[PDB]
Write a protein that binds this ligand. Structure first.
Ligand SMILES: CCCCCCCCCCCCCCCCCC(=O)OC[C@H](COP(=O)([O-])OCC(O)COP(=O)([O-])OC[C@@H](COC(=O)CCCCCCCCCCCCCCCCC)OC(=O)CCCCCCCCCCCCCCCCC)OC(=O)CCCCCCCCCCCCCCCCC
Ligand SMILES: CCCCCCCCCCCCCCCCCC(=O)OC[C@H](COP(=O)([O-])OCC(O)COP(=O)([O-])OC[C@@H](COC(=O)CCCCCCCCCCCCCCCCC)OC(=O)CCCCCCCCCCCCCCCCC)OC(=O)CCCCCCCCCCCCCCCCC
Ligand SMILES: CCCCCCCCCCCCCCCCCC(=O)O[C@@H](COC(=O)CCCCCCCCCCCCCCC)COP(=O)(O)OCC[N+](C)(C)C
Ligand SMILES: CCCCCCCCCCCCCCCCCC(=O)O[C@@H](COC(=O)CCCCCCCCCCCCCCC)COP(=O)(O)OCC[N+](C)(C)C
Ligand SMILES: CCCCCCCCCCCCCCCCCC(=O)O[C@@H](COC(=O)CCCCCCCCCCCCCCC)COP(=O)(O)OC[C@H](O)CO
Ligand SMILES: CCCCCCCCCCCCCCCCCCCC(=O)O[C@H](COC(=O)CCCCCCCCCCCCCC)COP(=O)(O)OCCN
Ligand SMILES: CCCCCCCCCCCCCCCCCCCC(=O)O[C@H](COC(=O)CCCCCCCCCCCCCC)COP(=O)(O)OCCN
Ligand SMILES: CCCCCCCCCCCCCCCCCCCC(=O)O[C@H](COC(=O)CCCCCCCCCCCCCC)COP(=O)(O)OCCN
Ligand SMILES: CCCCCCCCCCCCCCCCCCCC(=O)O[C@H](COC(=O)CCCCCCCCCCCCCC)COP(=O)(O)OCCN
Ligand SMILES: CCCCCCCCCCCCCCCCCCCC(=O)O[C@H](COC(=O)CCCCCCCCCCCCCC)COP(=O)(O)OCCN
Lengths: 387, 57, 218, 75, 443, 85, 64
């Protein structure tokens, strides 16, 4: 009986109808597609199950779709969402491989498609490098899956070959020293895909890790590499895109410290606060709120980034992971300097914000002003909330 | 011509000074300082200790 | 609680040592076994065998730094030099091999000096690490202008001191640390006793130093 | 044992919960300390704060005794 | 609590006033700091001195942030509420008013908190405000702002895991249950020493103060000297001594030698200074070293004498900063070589300078004299030589104080004219407080 | 959950409307219907968060008791309670 | 001087020592309940959701 699979049939039927509707709308010469975007958001809601993580991903992708305008980009983001959703439910390396590869192909094509102006060739260059680096990591995953399949005779993810699969997962999160594909991507690709790349796949992969993964090894050297390299790199790079790429490497090192000491509640709290800050960061038009992102990414006390860092520090001290904790505290002391550089650049400066001329007047002030109210979330964060 | 801060300065600091004076001179003595609570209780204990020390001699 | 006369917790102490606190209904640890190479590497009774067991790991760091420098040198080579493959191989292997041998030398000197002072003094304390750090840093700092023949022994001794304090002394001092169950020496407060220590699937860098801290595995 | 310590803690908590005093008496200027055979009185917080208040009272009374005797000796 | 919410909401309404009404903006921001002074005076009226050690308690559920009043917190809160309207009289922009209003909220709530995590959250939420206040673009110094922020962050980051260690150990960060549980006192003691030895300027982590307290504006210098250093002392008296007393005994030779060398070396450095504001800025380190040793003696009435020295310093050194600020505001320099004969040209300002010079050197009829006598009684009762070190070095403090006064006040008359009504009324509450607390402090 | 979460949500909605005005160059009181919609959304969002507080406590006590951790009845009221603290 | 005597009487009338004791007891009770709840919560196990032995008692239904 197939009566337990109506959501899958609904997914496929919705894709079949959406392609035909997008074709009919384009035969009329419509230069805007807000109706297509609303149908895409409805389809996103209709295929998502009733778990916390699934709906967090769903609501995140509904918010992200407001920064994309063409039909093909919307289709690629939907088919990347299918991989992102179904990776959280993957209990093998077969589905794991297919979901990861679908996401990689969608990201590569979007990086090629959306570039404009003088930065087109730089974006295509960085997309090619990302594709080549992704191909060999995919080959490593397939090779060691074949080794595990031959040794165990089954699809269980146990044994020594899980160390290389773990390295595949660490590549997909931009963990140093395999971090330079993300550093290349941050310097050229436009802001909407940078917003997409810093939020949704990290959530999808960490939920797969929380749900169906065990390894008998450690990730401590990659924690050290990510934290020290990210902090020193963001201290040393004057371009703002490289600053935010290296600060992202530092944040993924903190999330790996939360993974390594168990306690995924602190991981989920810090990831949620980080995702809301990212949603504020890449949609800013008034540059004074760039200082709020700075004080809430430096871990300064009353804002929500402090709470996200401080439960990670608390659980690390609870299980006595002293050396990694000391390295994390040193890199936190270093991170403050370049977040202060951000504050010097964009707060202690005269205010200029250009008006719109061709309509759409400051079109994402709702989301940015809503996400700035991360100064009111700390009242709920101090309680036993995320567990 | 009176400067802009003068009425508010005199009201604020004068009402602090009068309030500190009334704290020192109109609060109950036990409420002002614990040494007024313990001064009568030390005196009776000293009365019943002086004659103890007299008898010990 | 708070008075200007005195601080009551400065003179309100226990008169006897306490008994051990029962934290769970099961009081046996669960953990994965240590590999035998690290078990052998902990032994200090043979100074030579200690240095032989420990020095290849410290040589791995020089191998990594040398491989980095060798690739960065290879990328800058003009085609008239890069096509000469024997000369290219001997240059790059020279850079890597010099870095690897220097790291292995510094590591062997540190481990041998540490275990020698350990066996000479008859006890394990922080003096052997400080002396080994001073010797290794003076070996590194020789031949350099002069803040450096003092600065490098200080840096290597400080690394030894930080190693002792963070990795050895603080875990030893907090062996009776409990995050769950009854508060230690405050069992009258009534916090309930769980059936077991909490099961945590931590990584290999976070392992329980006492059987009662947590159960590690899956 | 642990059971006896726990039952004593419950008794102390019940007593200090249902406690009252009026007619010119300040609580936290108690007349008598609470006598106990506890190892480390801070095991029971109510007893620790009670005896802290009593000890504060005694220190201030001894200061006052010194002043009265100094006036007498001067005379 | 309801009153505190009303005072915060009244203070925050300065932003909504349109900027073209200048008189209204000035009056509103001045009254917004006058009202908490009245409320804290009323809290002193309400206090029962023969009652419990902790009075007027409030706890906000499971959010930490629990509050209560003892004597040290109450005296420090009274001093802060005096000092903030004087700061309001020395500012001219809405940005300055709002920065000092937010600073007053954070200081007042930090002084009376009873939760360690609450203390951590409330205190160093002022870090970015101090960075913007010190590194202001045309006339500040970004180097000084970086130094003060980075030193404070370093100390706080050492404390934070030890805070969380005792929180996992016993189940709470409330100081009333942290003092009654069994905890690993060496680790937490080192974390608390790390924060409070940076807040109180103790060598070697003291180099931020000479840069920050000079690069700040006059209002910022008044706040930083008179208030923010004493948060380390109230940290010692409220959190560290009750919760880790075994550590506080075992660290006494180390804290003792740190205090002795800080006192001696900072007094020796003050003699070679050539900037008037740097002279005033160094002298605060020796006073805080005496405060710290008197706190750590724990001997006779140590909390009382150390709190009284904190109040005497918080009255006297902001007035010296105010006089230096007047000289800088109307002569555009802080350099000693440009000033001479200020007695003939500013007789009232020089008289105030002399009186506060005598107060800073702990001469009688000033609260510093009573303070230093009682602090040395507390130090003497442990050993006589630890008192002798401070006693014999009194010539070294008087040397720099009288040398600075004699160089700038006597000689050929050159320099600005005498003080205005506004400058005199910025100085005046500190003088009245000094005369009262140095003649009849108690009843 | 917390008793004053709806009032906190209303203050959040007011600050949201004021910031949406300040970003677009308008004074704080402009477009008060934006403030009203923000207040309604903030009220219901923070009430939902306060409901999740009680839900999380109930889940923790239920899972811990099924695993074998027997909690005394004096401490079960700290968890299995819709406490309006 | 009569104003001083009447203000002293006003202080004595407004002060309520039993209310101070109840304030102290309620403070201690709220703090103790927070500490007890947090200590019970800290028995916080963590494995993957597919660990059917560490989560043997949960009533989970699978679709596969
Ligand atoms: C069955 C499922 C039905 C559909 C559900 C998913 C689709 C949601 C898409 C949506 O709300 O479209 C926005 C759309 C408004 O777009 P628009 O006015 O055409 O565009 C104007 C500009 O965007 C400029 O206007 P703006 O940026 O100020 O407004 C953008 C938009 C939404 O703007 C945002 O994306 C920011 C809002 C942040 C709140 C996010 C909520 C998540 C909280 C998590 C709690 C758990 O505004 C709203 O908040 C509208 C909410 C209406 C109800 C939503 C349900 O809302 C509607 O028309 C109503 C949609 C509701 C169902 C029909
Ligand atoms: C009997 C009494 C009469 C009732 C009075 C109602 C107030 C006036 C509303 C005006 C209106 O409907 O149109 C304005 C305006 C359209 O007029 P317009 O100025 O020509 O359009 C400007 C642009 O061209 C816009 O162009 P557009 O036409 O394409 O704009 C479409 C507009 C939608 O408007 C429409 O299409 C029609 C509006 C509804 C009409 C029917 C209602 C009656 O887009 C939106 O969805 C605006 C989004 C703004 C935010 C909405 C809520 C966001 C929630 C997300 C959460 C964020 C805060 C959470 C805090 C964070 C915590 C962490 O629509 C809106 O902005 C709608 C905003 C919400 C309206 C509902 C208000 C209910 C709350 C009570 C109001 C309290 C004041 C009472 C006044 C009386 C005493 C003072
Ligand atoms: C640790 C004790 C606190 C002492 C700190 C030193 C205070 C500095 C000045 C000394 C004044 C002594 C005042 C004594 C009587 C006042 C009331 C009183 O008893 O003091 C209060 C607290 O006293 C204060 O708050 C004094 C306020 C002093 C601050 C003055 C500086 C601010 C004024 C600035 C200038 C204003 C001028 C304005 C005019 C233009 C409680 O202290 P204890 O008696 O130790 O408490 C008893 C302990 N137990 C309950 C457990 C039994
Ligand atoms: C402005 C809108 C965006 C503000 C976001 C702030 C996020 C954190 C940034 C770093 C902290 C800075 C806090 C300083 C507060 C004091 C201050 O100076 O307030 C400002 C305004 O600050 C505020 O936004 C005050 C309201 C927020 C705090 C009070 C309400 C919530 C509690 C006064 O106006 P000006 O400085 O003249 O504004 C000119 C802007 N610019 C520097 C870019 C040239
Ligand atoms: C996030 C919010 C901002 C940061 C947190 C601020 C927390 C509030 C401030 C501190 C609250 C306690 C005040 C001290 C005190 O003793 O208060 C008691 C006495 O009340 C007062 O008199 C309070 C005076 C408030 C002002 C004095 C300074 C304290 C902090 C100032 C904050 C505002 C300053 C404005 C400056 C512009 C409590 O009264 P109650 O009736 O609520 O408690 C009695 C009983 O337990 C029932 O709960
Ligand atoms: C108002 C915001 C601005 C508007 C814009 C909206 C942005 C889009 C939506 C938000 C995107 C960020 C969300 C990130 C994911 C966080 C939630 C992951 C799930 C999680 O934490 O775990 C669950 C706790 O849920 C919880 O209750 C977690 C609490 C919330 C965490 C986030 C903290 C920051 C806010 C426990 O799951 P379980 O125990 O039920 O699972 C067992 C069955 N497998
Ligand atoms: C680093 C941050 C602190 C900065 C100052 C550190 C100074 C050195 C610590 C001196 C402690 C006194 C001491 O020697 O006692 C030790 C007590 O062990 C212990 O318990 C060692 C604890 C010392 C470190 C505690 C500081 C932690 C602060 C937070 C760090 C960040 C998170 C953790 C990585 C071992 O005595 P001995 O061996 O000399 O005795 C000889 C006879 N056996
Ligand atoms: C005008 C001041 C007149 C003298 C007041 C005086 O010395 O009172 C002291 C408190 O000072 C104050 O009350 C001074 C507050 C006003 C500041 C200066 C004006 C001590 O009061 P006392 O020894 O007379 O109190 C005995 C009753 N217990
Ligand atoms: C390069 C030098 C390596 C070297 O000679 O190390 C020796 C053997 O360690 C090793 O080289 C161990 C690695 C052997 C191959 C695996 C131990 O050095 P030593 O203890 O004789 O050093 C005495 C200096 N004071
Ligand atoms: C500032 C704070 C200190 C910064 C540096 C800390 C370095 C030591 C870190 C450390 O010992 O932690 C380990 C993490 O794994 C590791 O860090 C594994 C490192 C393996 C040795 C690498 C040798 C060279 C390899 C080639 C170069 C790669 C980069 C090396 C820098 C495992 O801690 P534990 O299990 O002993 O903790 C026991 C207590 N819970």
């Amino acid at each position: 009986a197939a009566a337990a699979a109506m959501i899958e049939l609904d997914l496929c039927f919705g894709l079949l109808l959406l392609i035909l509707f997008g074709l009919l709308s384009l035969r009329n010469g419509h230069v805007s597609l807000a109706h297509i975007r609303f149908i895409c958001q409805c389809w996103l809601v209709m295929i998502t199950p009733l778990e916390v993580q699934d709906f967090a991903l769903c609501i995140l992708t509904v918010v992200l779709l407001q920064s994309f305008h063409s039909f093909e980009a919307l289709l690629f983001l939907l088919l990347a969402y299918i991989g992102q959703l179904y990776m959280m439910h993957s209990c093998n390396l077969v589905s794991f491989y297919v979901c990861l590869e679908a996401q990689t192909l969608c990201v590569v094509v979007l990086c090629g498609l959306l570039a404009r102006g003088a930065s087109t060739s730089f974006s295509v260059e960085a997309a090619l490098k990302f594709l080549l680096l992704s191909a060999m990591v995919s080959g490593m995953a397939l090779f060691w899956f074949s080794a595990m399949y031959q040794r165990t005779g089954s699809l269980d993810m146990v044994g020594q070959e899980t160390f290389w699969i773990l390295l595949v997962m660490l590549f997909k999160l931009g963990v140093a020293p395999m971090h330079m594909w993300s550093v290349d991507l941050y310097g050229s690709i436009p802001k909407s895909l940078l917003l997409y790349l810093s939020t949704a796949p990290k959530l999808s992969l960490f939920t797969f890790w929380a749900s169906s993964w065990h390894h008998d090894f450690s990730v401590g050297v990659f924690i050290l590499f990510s934290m020290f390299i990210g902090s020193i790199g963001a201290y040393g790079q004057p371009a703002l895109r490289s600053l935010f790429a290296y600060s992202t490497i530092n944040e993924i090192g903190l999330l790996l410290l939360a993974v390594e000491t168990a306690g995924f509640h602190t991981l989920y709290q810090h990831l949620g606060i980080y995702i809301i800050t990212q949603l504020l960061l890449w949609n800013l038009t008034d540059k004074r709120l760039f200082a709020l992102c700075a004080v809430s990414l430096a871990g300064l006390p009353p804002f929500a980034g402090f709470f996200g860092k401080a439960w990670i520090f608390w659980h690390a001290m609870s299980v006595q992971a002293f050396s990694l904790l000391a390295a994390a505290l040193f890199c936190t002391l270093l991170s403050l300097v370049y977040y202060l550089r951000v504050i010097r650049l964009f707060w202690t400066a005269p205010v200029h914000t250009a008006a719109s001329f061709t309509g759409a007047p400051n079109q994402t002030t709702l989301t940015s002003a809503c996400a700035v109210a991360l100064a009111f979330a700390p009242v709920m964060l101090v309680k036993p909330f995320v567990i | 011509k009176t400067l802009w801060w003068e009425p508010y300065w005199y009201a604020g600091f004068g009402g602090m000074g009068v309030g500190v004076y009334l704290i020192y001179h109109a609060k109950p003595l036990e409420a002002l300082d614990i040494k007024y609570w313990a001064a009568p209780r030390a005196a009776k204990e000293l009365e019943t200790e002086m004659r103890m020390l007299d008898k010990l001699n | 609680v708070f008075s200007g006369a005195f601080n009551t917790p400065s003179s309100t102490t226990a008169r006897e040592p306490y008994a051990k606190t029962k934290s769970s209904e099961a009081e046996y640890g669960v953990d994965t076994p240590v590999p035998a190479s690290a078990l052998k590497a902990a032994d200090k009774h043979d100074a030579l065998a200690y240095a032989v067991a420990n020095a290849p790991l410290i040589g791995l760091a020089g191998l990594a730094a040398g491989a980095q420098e060798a690739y960065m040198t290879f990328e800058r080579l003009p085609p008239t030099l890069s096509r000469q493959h024997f000369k290219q191989a001997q240059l790059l292997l020279g850079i890597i091999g010099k870095k690897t041998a220097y790291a292995t030398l510094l590591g062997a000197v540190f481990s041998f000096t540490d275990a020698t002072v350990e066996n000479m003094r008859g006890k394990h304390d922080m003096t052997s690490g400080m002396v080994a750090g001073a010797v290794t840093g003076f070996l590194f700092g020789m031949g350099r202008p002069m803040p450096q023949p003092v600065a490098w022994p200080l840096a290597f001794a400080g690394a030894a001191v930080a190693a002792d304090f963070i990795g050895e002394l603080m875990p030893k001092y907090m062996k009776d640390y409990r995050i769950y169950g009854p508060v230690v020496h405050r069992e009258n407060w009534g916090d309930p006793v769980p059936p077991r220590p909490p099961i945590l699937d931590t990584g290999a860098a976070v392992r329980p130093s006492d059987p009662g801290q947590f159960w590690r595995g899956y | 044992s642990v059971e006896e310590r726990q039952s004593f803690h419950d008794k102390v908590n019940d007593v200090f919960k249902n406690l009252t005093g009026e007619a010119g008496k300040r609580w936290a200027r108690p007349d008598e300390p609470i006598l106990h055979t506890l190892n480390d009185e801070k095991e029971e917080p109510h007893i620790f704060f009670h005896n802290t208040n009593y000890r504060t009272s005694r220190k201030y009374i001894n200061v006052e005794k010194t002043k009265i005797l100094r006036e007498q000796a001067l005379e | 609590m309801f009153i505190s919410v009303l005072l915060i909401l009244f203070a925050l309404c300065v932003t909504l006033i349109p900027e073209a009404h200048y008189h209204m903006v000035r009056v509103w921001s001045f009254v917004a700091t006058i009202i908490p002074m009245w409320v804290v005076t009323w809290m002193w009226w309400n206090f029962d001195a023969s009652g419990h050690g902790l009075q007027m308690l409030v706890i906000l559920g499971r959010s930490h942030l629990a509050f209560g009043i003892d004597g040290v917190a109450l005296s420090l809160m009274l001093l802060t509420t005096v000092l903030f309207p004087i700061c309001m009289m020395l500012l001219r922009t809405v940005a300055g008013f709002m920065t000092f209003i937010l600073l007053e909220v954070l200081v007042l709530s930090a002084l009376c908190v009873l939760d360690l995590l609450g203390f951590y959250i409330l205190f160093e939420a002022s870090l970015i405000l101090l960075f913007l206040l010190i590194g202001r673009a045309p006339y500040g110094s970004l180097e000084a702002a970086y130094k003060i922020v980075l030193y404070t962050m370093a100390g706080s980051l050492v404390l934070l895991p030890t805070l969380f260690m005792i929180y996992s150990e016993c189940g709470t960060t409330n100081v009333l249950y942290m003092t009654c549980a069994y905890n690993h006192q060496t680790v937490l003691g080192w974390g608390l020493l790390a924060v409070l030895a940076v807040k109180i300027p103790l060598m070697p982590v003291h180099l931020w103060l000479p840069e920050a307290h000079v690069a700040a504006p006059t209002a910022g210098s008044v706040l930083l000297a008179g208030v923010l250093l004493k948060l380390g002392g109230i940290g010692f008296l409220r959190f560290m001594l009750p919760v880790v007393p075994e550590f506080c005994v075992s660290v006494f030779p180390l804290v003792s030698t740190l205090c002795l060398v800080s006192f001696l070396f900072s007094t020796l450095s003050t003699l070679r200074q050539i900037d008037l504001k740097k002279i005033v800025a160094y002298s605060s380190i020796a006073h805080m070293s005496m405060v710290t040793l008197a706190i750590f003696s724990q001997s006779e009435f140590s909390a009382y004498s150390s709190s009284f020295l904190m109040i005497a310093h918080g009255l006297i050194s902001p007035a010296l900063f105010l006089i230096v600020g007047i000289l800088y505001d109307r002569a555009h320099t802080k350099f000693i070589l440009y000033f001479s004969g200020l007695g003939a040209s500013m007789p009232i300002g020089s008289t105030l300078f002399f009186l506060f010079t005598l107060g800073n050197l702990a001469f009688p009829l000033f609260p510093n004299f009573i303070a230093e006598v009682l602090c040395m009684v507390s130090i003497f009762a442990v050993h006589e030589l630890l008192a002798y070190v401070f006693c014999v070095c009194q010539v070294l403090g008087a040397a720099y104080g009288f040398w600075a006064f004699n160089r700038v006040v006597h000689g050929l008359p050159r320099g600005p004219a005498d003080v205005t009504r506004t400058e005199f009324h910025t100085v005046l509450p500190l003088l009245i407080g000094a005369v009262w607390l140095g003649i009849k402090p108690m009843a | 959950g917390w008793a004053y979460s709806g009032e906190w949500g209303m203050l959040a909605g007011f600050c949201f409307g004021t910031l949406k005005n300040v970003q677009e160059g308008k004074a704080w009181f402009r477009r008060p219907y934006i403030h009203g919609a923000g207040m309604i959304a903030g009220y219901y969002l923070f009430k939902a968060a306060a409901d999740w507080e009680d839900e999380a406590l109930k889940r923790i006590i239920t899972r811990y008791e099924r695993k074998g951790y027997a909690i005394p009845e004096d401490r079960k009221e700290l968890f299995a309670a819709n406490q309006y603290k | 001087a009569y104003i001083l005597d009447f203000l002293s009487y006003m202080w004595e009338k407004n002060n309520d020592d039993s209310a101070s004791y109840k304030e102290w007891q309620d403070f201690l009770d709220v703090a103790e309940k927070d500490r007890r709840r947090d200590r019970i919560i800290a028995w916080r196990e963590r494995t993957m959701y597919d660990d059917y032995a560490a989560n043997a008692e949960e009533p989970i239904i699978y679709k596969r």
